[PDB]
Amino acid sequence: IVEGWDAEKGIAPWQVMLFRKSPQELLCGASLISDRWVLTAAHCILYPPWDKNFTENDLLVRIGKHSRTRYERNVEKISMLEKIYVHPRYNWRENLDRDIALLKLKKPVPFSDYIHPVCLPDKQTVTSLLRAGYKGRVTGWGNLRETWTTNINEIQPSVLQVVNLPIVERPVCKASTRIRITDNMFCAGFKVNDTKRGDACEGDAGGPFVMKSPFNNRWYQMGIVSWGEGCDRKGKYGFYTHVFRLKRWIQKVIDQFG
């Protein structure tokens, strides 16, 4: 995450890491909606353009971590994936519409001070918090900046980052790019084009875009770090999967275990 900062321990117990088994590789971010289910970006699982087609065995998830690398034993819990459920009408060819997927952990994960699930929004919460101006939060171990001072590939944080970003009006989101965005994605970043800066970059995918309801004091995941052009590019906003819209799908899958 660009322009973000070090996340206090246990700030986001739901934050998850999508780890590739062999070779070991930190692919994307993910969330914990339950002790049996992990939610993440679909393109993190399937992206032909990059010969990217993982399966239950190719990878696993690490939960309750803080460090982007060391193995924080007695804190983080690893879990093997049982079944991956990537949305059917996911569109990896054109605009990356419906970027979403569900992860069924082989064995339920034990909760703790550093691992606790996040809440899926409801028609009521969405309508009141997901509006232009209202700020949300994102977290991940992604790149600290779009670019590489190349002789140095060290732009990857040492610890989970966190940035607070505001949501941008739909029209602007539409204008911002030539790509065709849909009602299955929303964008956030800054137009102010100075004030504050920040955005999610490569490696934040699957990361959750959360908001804390001032009503019941609980944290909700409004979006999923999907795509964007560049990172922290002025006049350019990020794009996350509209979680509430795919609620239906999520429902379907879980209720029928795929």
Binding site: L18, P49, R93, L96, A205
Partner: peptide
């Protein structure tokens, strides 16, 4: 140019063998 499809975010692990210049800049 000949393009524009979105830049997916899971970092460039798929091509962390990328670009810059054949060295020469401040």
């Amino acid at each position: 140019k000949s393009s524009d499809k979105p830049n997916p975010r899971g970092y460039p692990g798929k091509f962390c063998a990328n670009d810059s210049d054949t060295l020469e800049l401040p």
